[PDB]
Design an enzyme around this catalytic site. Structure first.
Site, PDB file in Angstrom:
ATOM      1  N   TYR B 304      22.709 -63.539  30.900  1.00 31.74           N
ATOM      2  CA  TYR B 304      21.907 -62.589  31.664  1.00 31.74           C
ATOM      3  C   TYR B 304      22.778 -61.795  32.630  1.00 31.74           C
ATOM      4  O   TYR B 304      22.603 -60.588  32.789  1.00 31.74           O
ATOM      5  CB  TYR B 304      20.803 -63.309  32.441  1.00 31.74           C
ATOM      6  CG  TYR B 304      19.601 -63.700  31.610  1.00 31.74           C
ATOM      7  CD1 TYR B 304      18.700 -62.742  31.165  1.00 31.74           C
ATOM      8  CD2 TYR B 304      19.359 -65.028  31.287  1.00 31.74           C
ATOM      9  CE1 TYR B 304      17.598 -63.095  30.411  1.00 31.74           C
ATOM     10  CE2 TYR B 304      18.259 -65.390  30.532  1.00 31.74           C
ATOM     11  CZ  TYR B 304      17.383 -64.420  30.098  1.00 31.74           C
ATOM     12  OH  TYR B 304      16.287 -64.779  29.347  1.00 31.74           O
ATOM     13  N   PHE B 307      24.357 -58.772  31.024  1.00 28.71           N
ATOM     14  CA  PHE B 307      23.419 -57.678  30.787  1.00 28.71           C
ATOM     15  C   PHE B 307      23.036 -56.965  32.081  1.00 28.71           C
ATOM     16  O   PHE B 307      22.709 -55.779  32.073  1.00 28.71           O
ATOM     17  CB  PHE B 307      22.158 -58.194  30.090  1.00 28.71           C
ATOM     18  CG  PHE B 307      22.385 -58.644  28.675  1.00 28.71           C
ATOM     19  CD1 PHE B 307      23.437 -58.136  27.930  1.00 28.71           C
ATOM     20  CD2 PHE B 307      21.543 -59.574  28.089  1.00 28.71           C
ATOM     21  CE1 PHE B 307      23.645 -58.549  26.628  1.00 28.71           C
ATOM     22  CE2 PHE B 307      21.746 -59.991  26.787  1.00 28.71           C
ATOM     23  CZ  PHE B 307      22.799 -59.478  26.055  1.00 28.71           C
ATOM     24  N   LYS B 313      21.647 -48.853  33.139  1.00 31.95           N
ATOM     25  CA  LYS B 313      20.357 -49.319  32.637  1.00 31.95           C
ATOM     26  C   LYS B 313      19.374 -49.572  33.776  1.00 31.95           C
ATOM     27  O   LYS B 313      18.178 -49.320  33.642  1.00 31.95           O
ATOM     28  CB  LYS B 313      20.529 -50.587  31.797  1.00 31.95           C
ATOM     29  CG  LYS B 313      21.194 -50.354  30.451  1.00 31.95           C
ATOM     30  CD  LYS B 313      21.251 -51.630  29.624  1.00 31.95           C
ATOM     31  CE  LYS B 313      22.206 -52.646  30.224  1.00 31.95           C
ATOM     32  NZ  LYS B 313      22.340 -53.848  29.354  1.00 31.95           N
ATOM     33  N   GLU B 415      12.765 -54.306  28.199  1.00 32.44           N
ATOM     34  CA  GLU B 415      14.121 -53.970  27.789  1.00 32.44           C
ATOM     35  C   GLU B 415      14.545 -54.922  26.679  1.00 32.44           C
ATOM     36  O   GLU B 415      15.430 -55.756  26.863  1.00 32.44           O
ATOM     37  CB  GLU B 415      15.078 -54.058  28.979  1.00 32.44           C
ATOM     38  CG  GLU B 415      16.296 -53.148  28.883  1.00 32.44           C
ATOM     39  CD  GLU B 415      17.381 -53.701  27.980  1.00 32.44           C
ATOM     40  OE1 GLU B 415      18.340 -54.304  28.506  1.00 32.44           O
ATOM     41  OE2 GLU B 415      17.280 -53.529  26.746  1.00 32.44           O
ATOM     42  N   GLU B 424      16.514 -56.687  17.949  1.00 32.23           N
ATOM     43  CA  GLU B 424      16.070 -57.796  18.786  1.00 32.23           C
ATOM     44  C   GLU B 424      14.555 -57.939  18.711  1.00 32.23           C
ATOM     45  O   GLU B 424      13.943 -58.641  19.518  1.00 32.23           O
ATOM     46  CB  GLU B 424      16.525 -57.608  20.233  1.00 32.23           C
ATOM     47  CG  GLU B 424      18.025 -57.726  20.425  1.00 32.23           C
ATOM     48  CD  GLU B 424      18.426 -57.736  21.885  1.00 32.23           C
ATOM     49  OE1 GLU B 424      17.527 -57.652  22.749  1.00 32.23           O
ATOM     50  OE2 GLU B 424      19.639 -57.829  22.170  1.00 32.23           O
TER      51      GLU B 424
HETATM   52  N1  LIG Z   1       7.832 -62.031  22.939  1.00 36.63           N
HETATM   53  C1  LIG Z   1       8.353 -62.190  24.180  1.00 36.63           C
HETATM   54  N2  LIG Z   1       7.602 -62.666  25.198  1.00 36.63           N
HETATM   55  C2  LIG Z   1       8.108 -62.829  26.436  1.00 36.63           C
HETATM   56  N3  LIG Z   1       9.379 -62.536  26.766  1.00 36.63           N
HETATM   57  C3  LIG Z   1      10.243 -62.051  25.843  1.00 36.63           C
HETATM   58  C4  LIG Z   1       9.765 -61.845  24.467  1.00 36.63           C
HETATM   59  N4  LIG Z   1      10.807 -61.362  23.767  1.00 36.63           N
HETATM   60  C5  LIG Z   1      11.860 -61.265  24.617  1.00 36.63           C
HETATM   61  N5  LIG Z   1      11.523 -61.672  25.855  1.00 36.63           N
HETATM   62  C6  LIG Z   1      12.423 -61.706  27.035  1.00 36.63           C
HETATM   63  O1  LIG Z   1      12.960 -60.408  27.296  1.00 36.63           O
HETATM   64  C7  LIG Z   1      14.337 -60.494  27.670  1.00 36.63           C
HETATM   65  C8  LIG Z   1      15.145 -59.493  26.854  1.00 36.63           C
HETATM   66  S1  LIG Z   1      16.810 -59.411  27.429  1.00 36.63           S
HETATM   67  C9  LIG Z   1      17.420 -58.189  26.317  1.00 36.63           C
HETATM   68  C10 LIG Z   1      18.802 -57.712  26.747  1.00 36.63           C
HETATM   69  C11 LIG Z   1      19.114 -56.355  26.124  1.00 36.63           C
HETATM   70  N6  LIG Z   1      18.905 -56.424  24.651  1.00 36.63           N
HETATM   71  C12 LIG Z   1      20.540 -55.979  26.403  1.00 36.63           C
HETATM   72  O2  LIG Z   1      21.434 -56.243  25.598  1.00 36.63           O
HETATM   73  O3  LIG Z   1      20.850 -55.397  27.443  1.00 36.63           O
HETATM   74  C13 LIG Z   1      14.784 -61.927  27.425  1.00 36.63           C
HETATM   75  O4  LIG Z   1      15.080 -62.553  28.675  1.00 36.63           O
HETATM   76  C14 LIG Z   1      13.604 -62.623  26.775  1.00 36.63           C
HETATM   77  O5  LIG Z   1      13.383 -63.900  27.378  1.00 36.63           O
END
Ligand SMILES: Nc1ncnc2c1ncn2[C@@H]1O[C@H](CSCC[C@H](N)C(=O)O)[C@@H](O)[C@H]1O
Ligand SMILES: Nc1ncnc2c1ncn2[C@@H]1O[C@H](CSCC[C@H](N)C(=O)O)[C@@H](O)[C@H]1O
Lengths: 602, 617
Positions: B304, B307, B313, B415, B424
């Protein structure tokens, strides 16, 4: 004996139609498992919620019938590569539905027609269905020899051969040459050229569709095909493919097919693909020798060689006063020794024979003739020719240690060790042999080698080893060039069997390099030769199968290009192997380096 | 610190030469282990029976000195690719002799020069020696940037293009199957090729750079000085951290060898400050990893933190919420209208704080819902909740697709974008979270689009080829996407829009299964190795983020590009077209990509049925 099927557009009664086509003489039936007009919605109401059955159930026929008598047909309204997104979606759902139902019934084959060049999404859905559980279902791809637009009549005033081949090639390439995907060609009124036809025949054809409209009506109102069509049926006969009769009755067309068979022009290692045998490293089986001893051409030339050899080293005044010392190096089970004796008495000349052999199991056979036919004139020696001390030098030495590539059975290494007990003016048979290499194109043999992946070894080791193949299984891209050459007795300053050469070839067409075919020729004695080179009428053309040196990365080439291949022969004293690499038009990696994938013992 | 070595033509006393060059400032010595004139016979008397040692003993130096101080040099009289059989056979025996002895000494590196295009027999002998057990010895292939015939003075009346020596190295390395033990040691001449040619050289595993004493200019004070053209090449070599080797006699200047080393150290401490670089440093330069899946997997706190290191961003998202608020609630409703904002995938905070500060900047009141499925991240979220935020932010632990919101939202902020945009599974997550968005609700981001471009990279391909793991398909590595860097590949054509997803999706039947055929025209003679993947997105109106090559929108450093490899590389001519069939599949349990090349040569469909690569849920 001509296995035939019937292609129907629609079946009103399955039980009645089967018996009806059985009385006509048909073996199987090509029918749609869903009604060809029964289109269906999967996403939009209210057509999506259509009640009632989707098609007739599986309980109409027994499981035996579905697995042997029925070949399913895909609905023609299904277009998985439609530019319309809505239609593409619906087709994908319908495609999966019918593919799943065909596997549910346990169908042996399922017809999927190709009507265009773009069948990308179809291939995607098909290989998916194959990968997801469902199995044991052959997939016949209906592809016409000529495009429908090229067979239509010139009736449009504002709109007046390799086409359909791309349809099949691109689809099969996309499907990664899956084994469950075969070809079902459809014959039009006009056929492509003879070369194109032969190219189609190289493909895994499982069925040939004969439209009822390509048949001509004879004087007595009987179906008849042109000689052009007839020659194609003759080629399809020797492939043992099935024939499907499609079209209207206006039905014993099978009679003419049987008529073309009963009176068909006269002529199975054709698929065969294994690694070259190593007689020096492995003691051959009796059944193996019999195959080698089944060719009279090798026996004749080896007899004619010894015949002329004696006549050129002893005159008439020494016809009975001069006794030559002939040594059969690698006697085997007899034939070579008997060929010498049948050559000595043929042109009366006295010889003292020594028959050596390292294979003890063959020695037993040799010592059978020793005390029942030959006598004391033929001395039997059990051991290696490279370690055996001869108590007498020899005038002539006869050996047949020649492989498909000439020296791949290590003939040079063996004769070089047996050279010391040869007289200063001695003659070695054969005197010399030369290997040849030719660039080839075979998508069939390549994928066949590609499937030779064994566990617990290099996953690419199959590409770094030679194979014994057949001539018709590939298309030779250029005339073979002389690779390596060995002559006996070797009067070189020092004997080194390590070789290297760069052979270049001109690409005349647009094709894909898949490997190199290896041939060889030899000179037993002067004028007496044995050769397996393609463009050569020299005897022995059916005595050896050609060899194949595969390549890892197939090389697509344009016309006007050049193919330089680096070829090595290596000898580390313990093993002998070949290394090869392509340096034009693109540089590949050195295949079988240090003999990591392929070696030859001793 | 700049590590450098000395290239000597010959050495009388080894112990003397070492200490001599050691006090000059050198760290190692490039010397031959056999006398360069000691040509020897192997197959013919009486020269064959030559008495005495073949060369000096190994007891002259300790094992430590042999392993760290000495780089062996192959004899130049050894020509294993001579068209004369007697010369070749002699050279082959001589080649194996010096190679086996260099490995016997435990030499860290061995010098073998390439002087022609045809080194086929050289390759065979080299990869053999590597395969017969003797390893741990790097092989420096000395290849000049310019051919000796192209650097000679035009002094011949009857005898009066720069990628000539590149073919020497490329053909050799290809024949050697891109072996790991084979490196490149470039030799710099007076004339240098194109900058693009140089950039292609630097892509190769360069371990050393040879600096002849004849390329140095004598300053008006008598000190060795390089030209500005050469200085820029040295600067590029500095960031590759290669070692420099000085070859030739120092009597071209009025000073000694140490002055040559001081000048390089001078250039090092005066080398230009690097930017447009250093993002990746030091470094994600050779980054070849699989795309992270924040949905199938719970990210670590360290992950984290990476990111959350990009202020771009954070700024753009804060700007998006800023503009979105002002557009959906007027000035007369400055306090009577409370906007319901939901941060879907709150992570550790950042998106929630960026929304709160955007509310204060716009002077609008918002009710915040911070939802997250990662239980570990929720712990961090409830730290801000009970220390900084307050009751205005409601922290929810769970999936946004399964969570039942007790209140519809005006704005949803997420995001979930990957390097390829939707890799993703952002669409699937937002689609299942679309129901609790108001009929006039705004989603951030509102849309995003992936891009594909045909590339060429023998470097990246061989890196993927080495990613063969045990207990699986030996070709599975080619059927999966990799997160890579731009400078590791060469783009062959401008990227085309692949798949587009907009939120909220107001389609009749929501389907995330996609298919497209992208065609590109080739203008060079190159080899297709795969396809690069980029993406662009629209957070709010005019506020965007993009990693597309020639994009003027911010976010060029916010994501690494993605790579879809190919099994069989395709050598292409100019004028050829490249049609690629690309699929995005969703079977309800998994999501994946399938790709195939149908032009110029028809390949096979990669990753069919997600047999090699899938994405969770
Ligand atoms: N279906 C869902 N429900 C709740 N939280 C979700 C989810 N899918 C993803 N997330 C949360 O959203 C966050 C995305 S972080 C993505 C980082 C971004 N792709 C980058 O590279 O900069 C993650 O912490 C994840 O826990
Ligand atoms: N060094 C050696 N000493 C003794 N016998 C040998 C030998 N090398 C080979 N042989 C014998 O020579 C015979 C070769 S048979 C070769 C058949 C030939 N390749 C063909 O295709 O027709 C074998 O029976 C083997 O036992």
């Amino acid at each position: 004996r001509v296995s035939s099927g019937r292609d129907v557009a629609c079946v009103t009664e399955v039980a009645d139609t089967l018996g009806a086509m059985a009385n006509q003489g048909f073996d199987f039936l090509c029918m749609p498992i869903f009604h060809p007009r029964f289109k269906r919605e999967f996403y939009k109401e209210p057509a999506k919620s259509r009640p009632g059955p989707q098609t007739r159930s599986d309980l109409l026929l027994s499981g035996r019938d579905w697995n042997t008598l029925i070949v399913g047909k895909l609905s023609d309204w299904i277009k998985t590569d439609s530019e319309v997104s809505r239609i593409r979606k619906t087709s994908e759902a319908a495609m999966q539905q019918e593919l799943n139902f065909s596997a549910y019934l346990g169908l042996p084959a399922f017809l999927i027609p190709l009507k265009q060049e773009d069948n990308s999404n179809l291939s995607r859905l098909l290989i998916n269905h194959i990968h997801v559980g469902h199995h044991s279902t052959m997939f016949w791809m209906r592809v016409p020899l000529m495009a429908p637009n090229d067979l239509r009549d010139d009736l449009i005033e504002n709109e007046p051969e390799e086409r359909t081949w791309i349809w099949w090639h691109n689809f099969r390439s996309l499907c990664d040459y899956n084994k469950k995907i075969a070809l079902a060609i459809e014959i039009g009124a006009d056929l492509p050229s003879g070369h194109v036809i032969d190219r189609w025949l190289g493909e895994p054809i499982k069925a040939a569709f004969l439209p009822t409209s390509i048949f001509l009506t004879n004087k007595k109102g009987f179906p008849v095909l042109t000689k052009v069509h007839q020659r194609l049926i003759f080629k399809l006969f020797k492939l043992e493919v099935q024939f499907v009769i499609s079209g209207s009755h206006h039905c014993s067309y099978l009679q003419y097919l049987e008529y073309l068979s009963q009176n068909s022009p006269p002529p199975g290692y054709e698929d065969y693909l294994q690694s070259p045998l190593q007689p020096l490293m492995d003691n051959l089986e009796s059944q193996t020798y019999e195959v080698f001893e089944k060719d009279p051409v090798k026996y004749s030339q080896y007899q004619q060689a010894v015949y002329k050899c004696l006549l050129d080293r002893v005159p008439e005044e020494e016809k009975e006063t001069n006794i030559q010392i002939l040594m059969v190096l690698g006697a085997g089970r007899g034939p070579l020794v008997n060929a010498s004796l049948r050559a000595a008495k043929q042109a009366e000349r006295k010889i003292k024979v020594y028959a050596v052999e390292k294979n003890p199991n063959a020695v037993i056979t040799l010592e059978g003739w020793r005390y029942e036919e030959w006598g004391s004139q033929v001395t039997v020696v059990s051991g290696d020719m490279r370690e055996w001390k001869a108590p007498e030098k020899a005038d002539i030495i006869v050996s047949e240690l020649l492989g498909s590539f000439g020296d791949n059975e290590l003939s040079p290494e063996c004769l070089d060790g047996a050279q010391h007990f040869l007289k200063d003016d001695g003659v070695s048979i054969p005197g010399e042999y030369t290997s040849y290499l030719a660039p080839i194109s075979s998508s069939k043999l390549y994928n066949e080698v590609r499937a030779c992946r064994e566990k617990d070894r290099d996953p690419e080791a199959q590409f770094e080893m030679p194979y014994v193949v057949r001539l018709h299984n590939f298309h030779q891209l250029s005339d073979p060039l002389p690779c390596f050459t060995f002559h006996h007795p070797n009067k070189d300053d020092v004997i080194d069997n390590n070789r290297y050469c760069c052979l270049q070839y001109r690409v005349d067409l647009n094709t894909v390099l898949h490997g190199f075919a290896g041939y060889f020729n030899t000179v037993l004695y002067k004028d007496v030769t044995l050769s397996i080179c393609p463009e050569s009428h020299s005897p022995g053309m059916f005595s050896w199968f050609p060899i194949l040196f595969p390549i890892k990365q197939p090389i697509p080439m344009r016309e006007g290009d050049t193919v330089c291949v680096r070829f090595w022969r290596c000898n580390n004293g313990k093993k002998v192997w070949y290394e090869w690499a392509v340096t034009s038009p693109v540089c590949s990696a050195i295949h079988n380096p240090t003999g990591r994938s392929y070696t030859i013992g001793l």
